Every structure is written in structure tokens, then in C-alpha cells.
Amino acid sequence: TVGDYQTVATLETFGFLPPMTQDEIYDQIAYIIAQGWSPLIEHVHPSRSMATYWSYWKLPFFGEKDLGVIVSELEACHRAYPDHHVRLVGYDAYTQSQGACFVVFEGR
């Protein structure tokens, strides 16, 4: 029906766009590393999705300059938790903030 817009539940960033291709994850990870940030993986049960602290996996990749490891550490968190959201974060140590924060896997 047009035009009847239905409110949809989203995560936050990149939520209105379709799920990312493997090649898109490559370029977002490469951008995160090229800014000098630290990657960090999280996950929750989709019901606890509004908790203030998700769950780590396993420790932030401090000083990692290779994106071929993070694309394999993302299938590990997903296979270990096949009903969890899998978020990707980019830690900024000088500002104490996050330069990136987008869900990669949505939770089967």
C-alpha cells in the first residue's frame, strides 16, 4: 500500500539500509583501521538489545593492522552465538569515544 509508512524497529546506524555485503564489511573495517581506531566486537540477545553494555568478544584488537583477521573473528562470534546481534565498533583512545558503531549480523 502507498503511502502507508509503517514504523520499523531498527538498531541505530545503517539500520535503514539493507544488510551489508561481505565486500562492504571489508571497506568499513579498512576505514576503521585507517583512522587509527581499535576494532571491537560485541553481541547480545536481541531482547536485551537496549542494554547499556553488550558483551565483548574477546578483547579489543589493540594495534591490529590486518583486516583479514577481523573478518574471521566475526564469523567466530556469529557461529558461537547464532541468535545474537553482532556489532562492530571502532574505539578512539584520544577522544574516549567511538568513531564507528554498526551491527553486522542481525541474529538468526
Binding site: 502507498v2 503511502g3 509508512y5 514504523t7 520499523v8 524497529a9 531498527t10 538498531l11 541505530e12 546506524t13 545503517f14 539500520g15 535503514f16 539500509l17 539493507p18 562492504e24 571497506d27 568499513q28 576505514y31 538489545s49 537496549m50 547499556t52 565498533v89 571502532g90 577522544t95 574516549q96 569515544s97 567511538q98 568513531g99 564507528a100 558503531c101 554498526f102
Partner: protein, 445 residues
């Protein structure tokens, strides 16, 4: 009494001084050293007269002195006068005092035809006495959980007429469609057709019912500008009791005294403060008279407030170098000296948090790649009719900007040129959204 007791070409300003830049041109014939010396005098001691009392004081210590004369490039009768003021002339943590002293009187003085305050260097000894932003950029993103992208807003229209319940009806539609902020217009205070306890209460329901349906945190800057400070605090405390995250105030028309009292109320109560620069064009607009908006941005960062209107986007306020100049000063912690962006001084803010740069006024969907390339991520984008002006309503309108924003970000990250490939960052996005696909047809092109 002839001055050149205020013209010290050999002086080297201390690190505790408060410097100032004036773009000036005086009467015909008088040399520049005299006329800049008159600006030095009339903004500090305004003297010498001849009195018995003016010898009870060491007045060479409290005098303001002009240590440099430079020529405006592109003009001949004008010049730049750099003047240094001792730190003792001002009250601590008082921005109402620093302007009353500087611009309080010199603008009426008769020997100057044109005088413009361009810049001020504040010393670190003065900065640490002021309250500053109640939260800042990095704390606001923490409390709202919004990372990696600029924030989005809308200003509810019609400004004049809607009841407390129809207002909340339109607030609910823009929030539930993709935005994360809505705005009270500057006029909305407590008019007969819509009292403020009725607007505050029905907005609190439209915000709380859209926060749960989307699963994202949402807000609405409620205007707590009033006629008295007892009234302003009353609206602020109503809004906090309703569980609201953010409010709004008009600092130029409500005054710095009220703005600083509100800014320190927000720190003890954990609220955010959004600032509107009403009546700025009365002072700031004309290129030879008044104060630059840069100086009123520094005073705002010192007084408080986490977001400040910078506008104005049709298609922008226009040069870009001047705007990017004082966006640096609202956000960065150390700003070098660059004349192209009109920074005359090296300004260090130490550890004082930054302020969000709000762009506003007439944005539409084809302006996103130019407003993401210019402003970056620590910006808010606020349209008035960009959301509401969509053929299918206010929720389908917000859903089209949130899709076009997240398509411009994810193309900036991946190394593409957003402000240069704008049409394929958008037409390839409308292939996966019929809400944007119809928005691109309206506001063509």
C-alpha cells in the same frame, strides 16, 4: 591627554592577557597609531582626564595597550589593531563582564567611523573559571548512544496555531519515521492558543511512544525561554520531571546572565542544552560594524550549551573558509592561527568539551553530500520542511532523509567522493527504498 601612552609597539603580551582584534578606520588625516591608541584607551581606562583621584592608583598597570598595527589586505583606510588587556580587569567566570568591558562603550566613541570586533584570545587562566558546556560532544553521544554519523532534526510547523495535542501529533510522526530530534520554534513560549504545561505534557507522550516503537532514543528540545528567571527554572524543572533529555534557550535575546544560570543548572541535573542564535543578524551581518559571530561563538562555548545554531544552508550561508574557521573553534581543543579562516590568534581550550555544530534552514535531500563533506560527523542537520514537505507525510519524509544520510556516510567511509558522485550515491539508494525514490523526484534536482 593626546595618547600614544597606549601605543606600545615593543610590548610582548603575557600568557595571562586577554587579546583582541579590531578592524578599524578612523577620521581622515589622523595617523593610525593615534586612532588605535584611542581604541586602546576607550575600552579600558578611557582617560587621561585631569583629576586628583586618578593619582591614587598605578594606572600604568590597568591600562590596555596596543602592541601591533597591521593593514587590512584589499583595503587602504582600514587597519588591524591588536590590543592587550590585563587579566585583572575582568571578573572570573563572567562573560557578561568581558563584553560589557570591551564592547560596552568604544562603539559610540566619535573618532571612529567603522569598528568591528573580529577576534578575542582568552587565556587559560580565564577559561578555567567558566562553566563551559554542561556535557559536550563526547558525553552527549554517550548518553544518547549515537555514534559514527551526524544527528538529524526537524522543526515543527506551523509555528503558530497548533494545540498542545496536535503539536504532539506532529512530533510523534517525524520521530517515528527516522529522525532523533524535534525542535520547538523560537516563538513558542506560552501563547494563549497553547500553554506550555499542555505542550510539555503531550510532547512527553509523543517522544516516549516513538522511543519504544523504534527502539532508539529520541528527544525534543522544549523551549524554556521565559520572561523571568524564576519562570525559566520552573519550565526546566517541569521538563526534567517528565523525564526529558534536552531543552532549549535563546541566549542573545534572553541574555548571557540567564544563559549561564541555565547552563549550570544543567550540570547538576544532567540535562542537555540547545542554543538558538536569534537576533544575530542585527549585530553580526554587516562586514564593517559590530561583532563577528566568531566572538559570540567563543563566548557561548565559555558560557555553556552543547549545541549551537550555525546555519543556514540555502544553499549555504556563504565563503566556506570563514565558516570552517569558527566551526574549528566550537569543536577543537587547540586551533592554530590561519588568516584564510580568519583566526588571528592561536587559541587553546585545554580540556574543555566541544559544541555540536547545527546546520539549519532549508536543507533538502540533494544537499546531503555537500553537508556531510563540509561539516563532518559532529554536526546536527535540522530541516523545517525537508521532513514535513514529503507527498506522503511527515513519517515518510523523515524516512527519506535517514536513508540518504546513511548512504552518504557509508560512501564517505569507503573512500568515495560524496560531494562529487552525489547522484549515484542517491539513485542507487532509491533502488532499495520507495520513500526516497519519490523524494528525489519532488525536490529535483
Amino acid at each position: 591627554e593626546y595618547r600614544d601612552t597606549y601605543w606600545t609597539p615593543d610590548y610582548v603580551p603575557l600568557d595571562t592577557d586577554l587579546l583582541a582584534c579590531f578592524k578599524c578606520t578612523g577620521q581622515e588625516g589622523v595617523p593610525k597609531e593615534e586612532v588605535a591608541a584611542a581604541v586602546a584607551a576607550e575600552s579600558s581606562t578611557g582617560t587621561w582626564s585631569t583629576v586628583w583621584s586618578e593619582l591614587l592608583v598605578d594606572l600604568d598597570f590597568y591600562k590596555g595597550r596596543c602592541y601591533r598595527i597591521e593593514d587590512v589586505p584589499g583595503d587602504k583606510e582600514a587597519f588591524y589593531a591588536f590590543i592587550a588587556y590585563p587579566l585583572d580587569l575582568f571578573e572570573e567566570g563572567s562573560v557578561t563582564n568581558v563584553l560589557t568591558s570591551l564592547v560596552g562603550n568604544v562603539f559610540g566613541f566619535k573618532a571612529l567611523r567603522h569598528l568591528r570586533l573580529e577576534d578575542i584570545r582568552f587565556p587559560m587562566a580565564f577559561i578555567k573559571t567558566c562553566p563551559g558546556p554542561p556535557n559536550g560532544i563526547c558525553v552527549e553521544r554517550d548518553r544518547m548512544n549515537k555514534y559514527g554519523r551526524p544527528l538529524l532534526g526537524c522543526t515543527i510547523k506551523p509555528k503558530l496555531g497548533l494545540s498542545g495535542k496536535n503539536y504532539g501529533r506532529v512530533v510523534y510522526e517525524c520521530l517515528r519515521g527516522g529522525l532523533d530530534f524535534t525542535k520547538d520554534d523560537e516563538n513558542i513560549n506560552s501563547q494563549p492558543f497553547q500553554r506550555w504545561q499542555n505542550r510539555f505534557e503531550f510532547v512527553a507522550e509523543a517522544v516516549a511512544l516513538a522511543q519504544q516503537e523504534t527502539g532508539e532514543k529520541k528527544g525534543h528540545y522544549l523551549n524554556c525561554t521565559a520572561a523571568t528567571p524564576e519562570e525559566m527554572y520552573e519550565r526546566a524543572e517541569f521538563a526534567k520531571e517528565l523525564g526529558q533529555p534536552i531543552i532549549m534557550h535563546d541566549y542573545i535575546t534572553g541574555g548571557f546572565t540567564a544563559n549561564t544560570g541555565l547552563s549550570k543548572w544543567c550540570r547538576k541535573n544532567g540535562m542537555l542544552l540547545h542554543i538558538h542564535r536569534a537576533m544575530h543578524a542585527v549585530i553580526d551581518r554587516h562586514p564593517k560594524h559590530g561583532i563577528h559571530f566568531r566572538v559570540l561563538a567563543k563566548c557561548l562555548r565559555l558560557s555553556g550549551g552543547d549545541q549551537l545554531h550555525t546555519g543556514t544552508v540555502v544553499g549555504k550561508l556563504e565563503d566556506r573558509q570563514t565558516t570552517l574557521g569558527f566551526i574549528d573553534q566550537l569543536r577543537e581543543s587547540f586551533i592554530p592561527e590561519d588568516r584564510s579562516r580568519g583566526n588571528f590568534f592561536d587559541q587553546d581550550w585545554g580540556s574543555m568539551p566541544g559544541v555540536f555544530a547545527v546546520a539549519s534552514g532549508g536543507i533538502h535531500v540533494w544537499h546531503m553530500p555537500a553537508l556531510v563533506a563540509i561539516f563532518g560527523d559532529d554536526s546536527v542537520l535540522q530541516f523545517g520542511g525537508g521532513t514535513h514537505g514529503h507527498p506522503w507525510g511527515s513519517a515518510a519524509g523523515a524516512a527519506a532523509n535517514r536513508v540518504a544520510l546513511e548512504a552518504c556516510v557509508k560512501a564517505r567511509n569507503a573512500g568515495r567522493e560524496i560531494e562529487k558522485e552525489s547522484r549515484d550515491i542517491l539513485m542507487e539508494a532509491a533502488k532499495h527504498s520507495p520513500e526516497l525514490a519519490i523524494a528525489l523526484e519532488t525536490w529535483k534536482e
